[model samples]
Target: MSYITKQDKVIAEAIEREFQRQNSNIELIASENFVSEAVMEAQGSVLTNKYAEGYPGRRGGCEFVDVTESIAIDRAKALFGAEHVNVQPHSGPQANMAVYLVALEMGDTVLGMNLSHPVNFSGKFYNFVEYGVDKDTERINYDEVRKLALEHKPKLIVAGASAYSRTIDFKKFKEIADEVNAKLMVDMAHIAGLVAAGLHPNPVEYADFVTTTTHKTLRGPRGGMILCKEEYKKDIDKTIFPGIQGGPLEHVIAAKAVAFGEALENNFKTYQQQVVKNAKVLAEALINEGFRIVSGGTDNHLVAVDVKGSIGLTGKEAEETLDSVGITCNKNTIPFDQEKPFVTSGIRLGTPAATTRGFDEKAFEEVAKIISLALKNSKDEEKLQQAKERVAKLTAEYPLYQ
Candidate 1:
């Protein structure tokens, strides 16, 4: 019999219990998602045994790791329509670091979106000068970005943002990059799956280099991947290996390839489309619930709620209230927010996992109602408990996994 049937399998039992907890809970964390079993299998595969310190055909040693790395890189290139792909960066930050090393010198001017944006946290590195845009637009001020790029002649003009929920004008950013003679780099980590599914704009063709995580909406492993133009391949690859990192995470690369394969399927496109639809419905419902939505609403997967005016609860308090009710969300700083970063006045929520589990607009509406009730009665413990019971019941109905 399997371990779950054994009486002494405490650890296995604990694992099952935690899985049940998450399965029965409402997960709204924008950056989190459940990977397919195939992807998870590769993540747990034997690929972790090798150490090829360099790119395929130019590795420091001879081994099958080279072949596996090549496969992952090629799949990523084909998936993103990128000319060059590097699958060795261990995480998104390292991928962005490689882009920086390839393009900019230390302290060299870099024009990026605000830190509170999702792209900033994707890597969580803050070495460059970031410029922000108008609050309501939820997009970088392209004119301002162009003006800055031209005035400062920054080494790189980076497009894409994290927190602001909308489509970015990647072509505009490309033009800005060209106008100022600066390279363009986009961190597409948050929406890579969306782009792969054709629900969002592709940044690879526009930007000189595009960096993204293998996971998140991509539904891969917890690692980073980089794509660049063919001409810059050597430079980016060298920077990623000898310059930024030593040994690559082979297990993660294998899992990334599995994810790319899954993403290439017809069902993956449907899954991504559902993610967007659920997001739209949830955001619209929140707006109608008297919540002051950041940027008015979302064009992507997340909706930011301004808690100060709409609910009189701090982001911390709101997060705690929803958490108590089994709804997971994170505190975020809204544009021009008066509150501090730690106790932000906003909460960001998304519907990727819920959508993945086959929850649609109706489920989103129900989730919003739970959140609305939690926020409205944030101070009432009894009401919060009641909401948790309701959330658990909904989770039972929509059960995330088989």
Candidate 2:
């Protein structure tokens, strides 16, 4: 902080404003989280200037990099129980793309989350056979999935969701993949923290490739990883190295190592359990307050609420109103959404960053009340001010990054 303030007043001041904003507001974005101080330090270390180009000795010599990245790989393997781990991919989409390159040719049929998933990489490269949740249950329908697999016979069946709020059946996905002689890849990016904590099903047990971001529920730095079987290690390494990216960011790699070490701690499990528990509380409270949860509830860290159905407000309006009251969340498309993506019918909420800052069930209950109140009376100036004060109290109680 001191060096940045001295070296570059512009960037440093902007960072200060962002820090203050985070301190004042509540974060409910599902796919984002706060990394620990150790990770932050590692990310900002002097290694930022260091260059390794490719693998340890491949691009001249960065053998010292080999030690830190290898530690990251080993910790990820221990955490996920995978036969092989690749820590080179720059982000989640890169990891998945490497697997895609190794497994399929152009126009190969692949099924998973829609066009927006896989960092928008899958749709561009493959014949993406999209699937959807059940109309009534708002969850992925396995019967529908199997029928599609039998008919289309996609070369790969991807399991995971960007906005889903329930447990995914990896075993069922693998079964469907097997029946059609397809490879299974689970982009468990959002739930990597849960999987490492043993709260979510380990996709490594069934997936031929499992790609995930180290951030989010994993509470790591901004990075991605892939877990594969030993037989595919060399294929994955080459695919990541020469097929997609050039040099690895050794500093971020160091940060990933630090975060993985933290995940091995017992309290990370405690933190993960609280994240899901808080999500459940928020969902139930919203339901009681007349908001309709997309799946009726959540079994994980996020909930999608039908704001348009409940309060006669589009998700765009609801998100803005909540932002006015210092609650930050994103507008999302509920399944079968008649409204388009940006101006959607629902708001997506999550507890990971909030939980990291020590928000519990009671805090989340108050949050739900504030949300219901703010959206219900968006134009009421006095009520909006009241909601803002309530948010200030909660943020003060939590005192983020203190």
Candidate 3:
């Protein structure tokens, strides 16, 4: 209905198609969220034309949005009650990379999450040792962590996860790092929004460096941020720019500022609280439907369902089965998965997107039942269609972007 509709139907049609898909589907993906209309507008603003390199002023800042970037840094500082913050990272991995440059050399021994990507810059460039959760408790074993640290003697310890389902004890992590004389970095990428709302422990108080993705639980435009001790400010800033990247994504930074301001509001706290509540509900409901929730339940927004153990279906089959019913989530490997990474034994689900779409405890229960029915009747076309119809009806009740 505009210039782009006629000028570039190819791109416009794809955008419209994605819009309809988001509007019609139930987004249960743990790492995905729907940004607010204001956040969207801020990202779609004309600021995209500006190629502002470096920080707000000291390095090579844009004359106008310098203040916008400053506003982002200030709000994040206030939001986390930290002394220093950097909002220029393009994603969580970038943020972590900056920390690595400041905290360690390329060949120094570091400990990251056990299941972290093997070929990632963090894994490939550094000498790494990894730690996983306890076998029976399905939680981080501090004793094992200490043993690993003492044995490996790593210079840096990176905590946080991609699919963990319990409360990470950052205090314990800090203690272990100190005892081992190791630098601590906690990637709070998945729980930043909850930490903002005080639903989860703030890593800023415990870790020497805290990194996060704004697009995850933070519910912002796709971007990353870093918070570190005051002393490393100059080095980390230099590492991100002139060292790694040239011009930052100023439009996304502005959008990040908008979301940070929104997270500062009381309503954000309410929303995050409900996010935690719905996740627990989803976990319990799934358990009721004969699924095994990793770590028994969630302390935050995600649920890791062991599809292989629960039923005969692998993660691939469960994900495709649910996708056919229009419930979108990703296949994931469990703590000790036997299958290939691409064909995992589990699925990761979350309530951030669903909760933002107005799904409550009762609604998540219905979602659980739907997931179960979809998988239970994977071969029945008639039943699957009915399940898809039910999904449509629920999505209709909670209209998105309408």
Candidate 4:
């Protein structure tokens, strides 16, 4: 009855295995979420056959794709309160690159998060000046950022991070950018859902350009978007089209529309609030279990734990041990980590995917206990097997996509 399984068993079997894996495990990746059936349907729709090379209104006579993209743009504009929205970039890095292409020249200086690797586009393309969290507080030091801004006077100040767990002070960043006559850009890829729910500061008001992934906390397809002032709309669009990428993915844009529509609903705000609450409880539970949470806790969905200090396990070991118990998370570098990038000292966990699977504080608390037990007895195969059984029981209790 299924064309995919009938025509291509290899790919179909892979998908089936991934679905089974997702259904069986507890997902704690900081930048992952499960989309709704509606969003998935839109992504799998017939729009995938279309080749809409340009923006919505001028998509080479593809009016239906235009309508879909327009819906995405309108919903996104309403969601973020932005003057202009471009839901065309293929991914988050592409969106950021579009902004860079439109805003800066070849050798212009950029002040960005120090946590970002040199492999990132901002670091590779521009003269990058890195700013980092305070060594003592493990949070952004506004005074230190201001000092760096004055010292570098970059053309663009990128304010965001992939690993940070605390709330960013967008107002302070705006002030710093203004003081240095630098244009401010915020990559709100990690916290867009919280921002939509008004749980976090809206960078749309503070930054010259805002770039975000449609997935992550937004709970959309794997795509990217750019929001900017009206003055830069044309340039941004042009850069995304001719300068960076070719034809846009119309199917993903349709999925983004569906996700944006869902975000506008009242229930979405309730969901985001619960995500934050779950993170807080999980962090408290872990700290009680003697794990050291970065920034002391989280202001959003993610919690970065320093496993070496607490469990004496390298991040890679903790990641593998947790995976052995069917708990999935990524090993990540902590602020000023002495370990190599590949072998980090910390692990990053998040509540979005589990929260999407209906995990509340109690569920997250149990998850914390499981993590503690699993890491403590990481070398014991019997204990790891028992931990896996507990994870299976928990995941079974909260059925995903049911």
Best by lDDT: 4
- Overall lDDT per candidate, in order of appearance: 0.81, 0.89, 0.88, 0.91
Worst 10 residues of 2 by lDDT: 113-122
TM-score of every candidate relative to the true structure = 0.92, 0.97, 0.97, 0.97
lDDT for model 1, on a 0 to 1 scale?
0.81
Candidate 1 lDDT trough over 10 residues, lowest sum: 117-126
lDDT of 3: 0.88
Tell me model 4's lDDT, rounded to 2 decimals.
0.91
Which of candidates 3 and 4 is the stronger one according to lDDT?
Answer: 4
> Model 2 Cα RMSD, Å?
1.5
**How many clashes in each structure?**
5, 0, 0, 0
- For model 3, state the Cα shift of residue 57 in Å: 3.2
Encode model 2's per-residue lDDT on 222-249: one tens digit a residue: 8789899888888998898877888888
Candidate 4 RMSD to the correct structure: 1.3
With candidate 3 superimposed using the best TM-score fit, by how many Å does residue 165's alpha carbon deviate from the native? Answer: 1.2
